[PDB]
């Protein structure tokens, strides 16, 4: 209509003016006197073998010892990182898996992909095997990410520009989140599991409200698709990884942009983003087979985790911040320290 | 120095590894094909002759084939196209009768141009199927081909026109030094496309073996 041709522009202009008036200083100016972190050297402590195809996702258990990896060979493997033993090996009905998750309690795992169905597996059964507890349907596009809120809830992001909250007991969509104009690629949950953020292909990110079901904030500033997102450990900031070879830091309270981590020698896109236990480091896997460690408070590179022969697709940090595990398209998993 | 439980866990892990290796060896000898198309272009007919992703299994001459159909995916292709980076061949279906309807031939040109020059399919052969043979002949018996092709100059006969679509489709493959595209005409009742696909996949397998040996 004629009204929307000016109302949206006026609202955007008002938001931009509020942001401009709210930016008194910059992060670099305040954290210019802080001492540098220094060079960070990490060595490959363990190497996990057994996958026969590209690895697309992985997750860490709450105990900081067990992890689950997903690959397009039709298998879901649970590893014991301390001894590199295979606790379980779940065979998937559909081999086009694109994501996986680990329940906080440790009883269930989830996976999904091009089949538009999120499958939930029960690990602790009296029969001694692993069986599919529930299969969720309703998404009209490929499923990109899934995270466990508790033992009876799960949040999924699909390629049909929607995110939904499920109820595992019944299988019905409890709430649906809309507003994006492109494929949603990843999401991360807040520490208190009351809010979460999603990164879509429309070069934007949003802050939802699980209890209510409405977008409370929208963040822009990128120039291409967004492939990764992660919350700061404090819970008042998050980082994004785009295809324009640039990671950025956004703050919920200020509703602004804080930093940008880019270098001339890097032109490839970012596939994963994660933080350290105290949030002083920011790791990110790239398409150039490397994984740079960024000083999150000064935007200076501190080290590189070279040693992968193909694209790095997944990246995670244990809950105690003791080790970093990366997975690449060469069907190998490495634990750094 | 391991205890009893640790030794038993190691034994279980070794058994899991053996099962994984056996499964990988079993699944590494199957032929994988990705079935593309512009929609309503004889894909159903081709499937007859042999939510999300759809898989079809058929056996020919003691060889197990897998066909993946991604027609139902309405999302962005740039995100999930890299999954099928290890497919042995790509099957493309284009309807000939749609030459004078709306323009669809130009959409097929665009789809073929996008697919054939992707950064992932730089060495993957493409099998091209042209459908609606008799229908196309019946249509060209009255409707000239110049409506679809403003620059065409030739006889209004099936033999000339069919070859003209052939060269225009094959010209888009501007990577002739590594990829070879195999083309075949077909209709509602042929009962010979299985042999053509078998020949194409045998050629691809021979070339892959030669590359693996380093001979060529």
């Amino acid at each position, epitope marked *: 209509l004629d009204q929307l041709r000016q109302e949206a522009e006026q609202l955007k202009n008002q938001i931009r003016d509020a942001r401009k008036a709210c930016a008194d200083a910059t992060l670099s100016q305040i954290t210019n006197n802080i001492d540098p972190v220094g060079r960070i050297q990490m060595r490959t402590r363990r190497t996990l073998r057994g996958h026969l195809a590209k690895i697309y996702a992985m997750h860490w258990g709450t105990d900081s010892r067990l992890l689950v990896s997903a690959s397009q060979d039709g298998k879901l493997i649970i590893w014991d990182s301390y001894t590199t033993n295979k606790v379980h090996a779940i065979p998937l009905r559909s081999s086009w898996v694109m994501t996986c998750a680990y329940a906080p309690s440790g009883n269930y795992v989830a996976c999904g992909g091009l089949d538009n169905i999120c499958s939930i597996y029960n690990l602790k059964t*009296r029969e001694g095997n692993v069986r599919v507890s529930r299969e969720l349907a309703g998404h009209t596009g490929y499923l990109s990410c899934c995270r466990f809120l508790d033992d009876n809830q799960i949040v999924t992001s699909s390629g049909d520009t929607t995110c939904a909250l499920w109820d595992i007991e019944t299988g019905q969509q409890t709430t649906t989140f809309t507003g994006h104009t492109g494929d949603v690629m990843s999401l991360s949950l807040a520490p208190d599991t009351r809010l979460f953020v999603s990164g879509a292909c429309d070069a934007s990110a949003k802050l939802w409200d699980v209890r209510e079901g409405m977008c409370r904030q929208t963040f822009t500033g990128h120039e291409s698709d967004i492939n990764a997102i992660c919350f700061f450990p404090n819970g008042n900031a998050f980082a994004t990884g785009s295809d324009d070879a640039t990671c950025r830091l956004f703050d919920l309270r200020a509703d602004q942009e804080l930093m940008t981590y880019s270098h001339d020698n890097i032109i490839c896109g970012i596939t994963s983003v994660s933080f350290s236990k105290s949030g002083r480091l920011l790791l990110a896997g790239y398409d150039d087979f490397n994984c740079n460690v960024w000083d999150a408070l000064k935007a200076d590179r501190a080290g590189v985790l070279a040693g992968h022969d193909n694209r790095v697709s997944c990246l995670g940090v244990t809950d105690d911040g003791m080790a970093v595990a990366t997975g690449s398209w060469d069907s190998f998993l490495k634990i750094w320290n | 120095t391991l205890s009893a*439980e640790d030794k038993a866990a190691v034994e279980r892990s070794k058994m899991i590894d053996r099962n994984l290796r056996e499964d990988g060896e079993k699944a590494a000898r199957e032929v994988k094909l990705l079935l593309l198309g512009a929609g309503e272009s004889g894909k159903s007919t081709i499937v007859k002759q042999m939510t999300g992703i759809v898989e079809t299994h058929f056996t020919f001459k003691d060889l197990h084939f897998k066909m993946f159909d991604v027609g139902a995916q309405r999302s962005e292709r740039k995100k999930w196209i890299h999954c099928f980076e290890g497919v042995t061949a790509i099957i493309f279906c284009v309807a000939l009768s749609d030459y004078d309807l709306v323009n669809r031939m130009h959409e097929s040109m665009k789809l073929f141009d996008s697919i054939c020059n992707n950064k992932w399919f730089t060495d993957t052969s493409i099998i091209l199927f042209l459908n609606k043979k008799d229908l196309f002949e019946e249509k060209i018996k009255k409707s000239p081909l110049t409506i679809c092709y403003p620059e065409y100059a030739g006889s209004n006969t099936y033999e000339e026109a069919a070859a003209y679509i052939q060269c225009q489709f094959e010209d888009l493959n501007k990577r002739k030094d590594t990829k070879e595209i195999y083309t075949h005409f077909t209709c509602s009742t042929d009962t010979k496309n299985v042999q053509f696909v078998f020949d194409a996949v045998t050629d691809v397998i021979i070339k892959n073996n030669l590359k693996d040996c380093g001979l060529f």
Partner: single-chain antibody
Amino acid sequence: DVQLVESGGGLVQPGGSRKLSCSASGFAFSSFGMHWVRQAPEKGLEWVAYISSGSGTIYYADTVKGRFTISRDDPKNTLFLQMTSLRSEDTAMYYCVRSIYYYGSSPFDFWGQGTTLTVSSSDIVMTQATSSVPVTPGESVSISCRSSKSLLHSNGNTYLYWFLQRPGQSPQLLIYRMSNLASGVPDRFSGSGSGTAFTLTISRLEAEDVGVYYCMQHLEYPLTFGAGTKLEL
């Protein structure tokens, strides 16, 4: 449901032979390791033999080593114990026990039913030193089991298990690794202690908890059970 049924009992003459079978139904038999545990009349339990998953590892008690044979047949879910040249000292009930070993697993989870085998005519020592304890309902009870060699391994795990046998019933797992609680067990039971000195505690002693308690070690594969502490009243 999960259940194990055994058969093959009866009277045997000295020096003879007999075959025992264990029929399993309700779980993944091929993914479990199977044990054979016998119990002489009023003389506590005693480990006999063990066969791993895939039949890749077999162990025997030295008292029957070279005399008994154990085998499994995954096709039809049956476990066999072939014994030849038996003597009068082998008269006892025989139990069929399952166990799966992985990180965080619960071995010795489920026990069989037992078949009578009436017949006519290094080595870690676990001690309980208690015979009977008369206790009224509603109180709290404590049971102490002591071993010879410390059971705390380098990994930090302390391999000690607690079992309870109700009158005329198969033993049930209660606590594994001296701190975990088996599934289906009420929270009243609790385990604690240090190396070489363990102790199990019951908070609210109620009915159906009367029986005999045994403590087992799982560090050195020759397994020894405790003498058994009986609970009366």
